[PDB]
Ligand binder design. Sequence first.
Ligand code: UU1
Length: 119
Amino acid sequence: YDIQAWKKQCEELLNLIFQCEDSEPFRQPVDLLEYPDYRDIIDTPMDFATVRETLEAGNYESPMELCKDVRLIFSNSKAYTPSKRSRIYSMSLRLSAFFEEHISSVLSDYKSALRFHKR
Ligand SMILES: OCCn1cc(Br)cn1
């Protein structure tokens, strides 16, 4: 029932994601010199360094907010891919499966802890 435990759990999960070769295209903001029309397709860029920085700044109140930004990295990749068989999009699908697998208990434990606090 530790209401604050999600934060270090999220830090450790971001460390695992950064060690994963599949996170390479998502570790930093998409390069606009490389993809000049990126902002014509994507309204809200997101990447794992921005997520880690937001977390370390104390700018996430809950793991649900962190989860919304991580899922935005994957939906941006799906929206920008020219094909569902592209290398970067294929890496995003594997990384998203790995993330969802690990974030589920973080979300469950936090929501359980908050319900106990308001019991
Ligand atoms: O690497 C993030 C930029 N991007 C390229 C494709 Br394909 C989808 N998103």
